[PDB]
């Protein structure tokens, strides 16, 4: 058994389905609160009514004192003889130390961290795990709030990514019968402000495996040897755990064309990119890990990151068409109080170039302009002012109709 | 080809110091 599911999800309960000032929600959150208070009371009584204790077996303190109080951590490198291994400290100073008993001489292996004494400097224990606080921090444990209900309609893309990352888990009977390996790599590309990170959030919200999230220009350190090692440890911790998934965002900071030039720092960038490229698909194995990689311009990527076998599915997010604008407007104004006058038809049809974030900004600007004159309900002229007065930076082309 | 380039850095190894031994041998 590996570290197992190691699931990452708070996700207490979302049922606020009334979504208004109804009694059902009040009674439901009452049930939630009283269960939480009940569990708290149980743990208080669990910790308060413990009467049994000796817990030293008249020798545990003996072992504790035999080993030094401020034990230090070192790196074993060889074991020439029984009871006379050879270790080293941080500064690279080796020492022909001894090995004492009360240390299971089974799990020690060259390259493993061990616990050492001060005054005599012998081996007295083995440190079980060593993960720096740059990889454990990357992990997520509280799921973000959104879900598929909020997406404005992307049926093709949603179905695609679901066949990629979700379906092989819940119902893995078909793929064996057909004899196929499910795809492992996905690219999300397109113009800015369209929804590339929404699918990341929505997938992370509802899943069962570990989720790891990394942003692009963070795999970089200045000591010439930390980048690739950090990448290696990242994939190691992902694979020792559950069927996790990794989300690398804003890649183009890492991978770009691998050309030859002068400066040494850029050589370091290329070295790190190339190490990741090996890690993803190199020699023997890969493991049960999926990778999602998101960017807003794709042509400037190294041809060795995009070839199939490493990234199997590519998904383009295009600008919304007139069918989708109505859905977006219906979602972002659902919890808004609103007047009988307005019709979203004019706003959606008058313009032909805008995206999801733009619609959200139009909604909030119009609502605020309605507030400006001491009202709550929103009218049509407010939406008109919101659309036209701001939310539009411009561009020019094809002058004066050369074509007719 | 003008230069606006940058570079990484290696560490400073010299850090160790001697300490008084405290062996107890009769």
């Amino acid at each position: 058994k590996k570290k197992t599911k190691g699931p990452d999800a708070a996700s207490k309960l979302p049922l606020v389905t009334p979504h208004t000032q109804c009694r059902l929600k009040l009674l439901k959150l009452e049930r939630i609160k009283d269960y939480l208070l009940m569990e708290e009371e149980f743990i208080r009584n669990q910790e308060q009514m413990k009467p049994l204790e000796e817990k030293q077996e008249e020798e545990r303190s003996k072992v504790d004192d035999l080993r030094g109080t401020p034990m230090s951590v070192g790196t074993l490198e060889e074991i020439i003889d029984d009871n006379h291994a050879i270790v080293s400290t941080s500064v690279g100073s080796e020492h022909y130390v001894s090995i004492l008993s009360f240390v299971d001489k089974d799990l020690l292996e060259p390259g493993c961290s061990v616990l050492l004494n001060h005054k005599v400097h012998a081996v007295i224990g083995v440190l079980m795990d060593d993960t720096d606080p740059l990889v454990t921090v990357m992990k997520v444990e509280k799921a973000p709030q959104e879900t598929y209900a909020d997406i404005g309609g992307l049926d093709n893309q949603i179905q695609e990514i679901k066949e990629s990352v979700e379906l092989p888990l819940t119902h893995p009977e078909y793929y064996e019968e057909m004899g196929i390996k499910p795809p492992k790599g996905v690219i999300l590309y397109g113009p800015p402000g369209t929804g590339k990170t929404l699918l990341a959030k929505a997938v992370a919200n509802q899943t069962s495996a570990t989720f790891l999230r990394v942003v692009g220009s963070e795999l970089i350190q200045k000591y010439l040897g930390d980048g690739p090692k950090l990448v290696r440890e990242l994939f190691r911790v992902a694979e020792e755990h559950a069927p996790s998934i990794v989300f690398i965002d804003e890649i183009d900071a890492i991978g770009t064309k691998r050309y030859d030039s002068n400066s040494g720092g850029e050589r370091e960038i290329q070295r790190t990119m190339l190490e990741l490229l090996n890690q993803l698909d190199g020699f023997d194995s890969r493991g049960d890990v999926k990778v999602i990689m998101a960017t807003n311009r794709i042509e400037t990527l190294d041809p060795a990151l995009i070839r199939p076998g490493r990234i199997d599915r590519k998904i383009e997010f295009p600008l919304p068409d007139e069918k989708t604008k109505k859905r977006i407007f219906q979602i972002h104004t659902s919890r808004m109080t609103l007047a009988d006058d307005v019709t979203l038809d004019d706003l959606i049809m008058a313009k032909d170039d805008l995206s999801g974030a733009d619609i959200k900004a139009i909604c909030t600007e119009a609502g605020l302009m309605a507030l400006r004159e001491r009202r709550m309900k929103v009218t049509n002229e407010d939406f008109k002012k919101s659309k036209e007065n701001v939310l539009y930076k411009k561009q020019e082309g094809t002058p004066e109709g050369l074509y007719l | 080809q003008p230069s606006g380039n940058t570079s990484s850095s290696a560490l400073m190894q010299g850090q160790r110091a001697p300490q008084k031994p405290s062996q107890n041998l009769v």
Partner: protein, 253 residues
């Protein structure tokens, strides 16, 4: 600049004082402002005056402080700045001359640049990324808006973009009145006439007119200010030149 100060106040101070108001009406709080215009029109006055009446913790990453020597640390400075802004809960971050970073993303190879782009992508992620921030505001200032990268101008990161136009007649007269307070003006000087003698004035040069008239008074060992001094200051501050060649002009009909 009345309209500008009203809208600025609205984006900056209202959502901090009254969040429940935005809980009602069912919308989400704006978080982005950008200021633009020709040089010397008052972009930094608003930043300072906001700092004076803020009632919040005013950070100040400005110019090109964030471009460092070694690779990588220039990025992590941004991350540490934002976490420091999270330690003290309500805060405003004021960039400046931002087109030093994130002018536009260029190609790869032995041309353009990479490191500044890594830093800019870090900043970009930091304010509309996977994790949502709250009670943190930003302000940016620049000339030449048209060259800025298009990944920052989207309404996710920046919400209201405000232009500072050169003053018209009324604004020129009013600025003249502000900047001639402590002076000692004789009598019978019609500041409207002097205001109309400066078409298209930048705005920062009304101070120039006032100081120059002052120095004319000082050189002669006097405390008056008369109108001739103002007129001569007007002539001295306004200066241009043209193509005396007369052939460059004539080739266009």
């Amino acid at each position: 600049l009345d309209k500008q100060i009203k809208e600025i106040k609205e984006v900056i101070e209202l959502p901090v004082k009254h969040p429940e108001l935005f809980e009602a009406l069912g919308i989400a709080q704006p978080k982005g402002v950008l200021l633009y215009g020709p040089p010397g029109t008052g972009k930094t006055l608003l930043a300072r005056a906001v700092a004076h009446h803020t009632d919040c913790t005013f950070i100040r990453v400005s110019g090109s402080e964030l471009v460092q020597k070694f690779i990588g640390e220039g990025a992590r400075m941004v991350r540490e700045l934002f976490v420091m802004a999270r330690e003290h809960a309500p805060s405003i971050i004021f960039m400046d001359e931002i087109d030093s970073i994130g002018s536009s993303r260029l190609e790869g190879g032995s041309g353009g640049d990479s490191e500044v782009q890594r830093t800019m992508l870090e900043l970009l992620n930091q304010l509309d990324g996977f994790e949502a921030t709250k009670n943190i505001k930003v302000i940016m200032a620049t000339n030449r808006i048209d060259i800025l990268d298009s990944a920052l101008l989207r309404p996710g990161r920046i919400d209201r973009k405000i232009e500072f136009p050169p003053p018209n007649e009324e604004a020129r007269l009013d600025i003249l009145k502000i900047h001639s307070r402590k002076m000692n003006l004789t009598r019978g000087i019609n500041l409207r006439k002097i205001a109309e003698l400066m078409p298209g004035a930048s705005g920062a040069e009304v101070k120039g007119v006032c100081t120059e008239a002052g120095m004319y008074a000082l050189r002669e060992r006097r405390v008056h200010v008369t109108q001739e001094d103002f007129e001569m200051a007007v002539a001295k501050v306004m200066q241009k030149d043209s193509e005396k060649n007369m052939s460059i002009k004539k080739l266009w009909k």
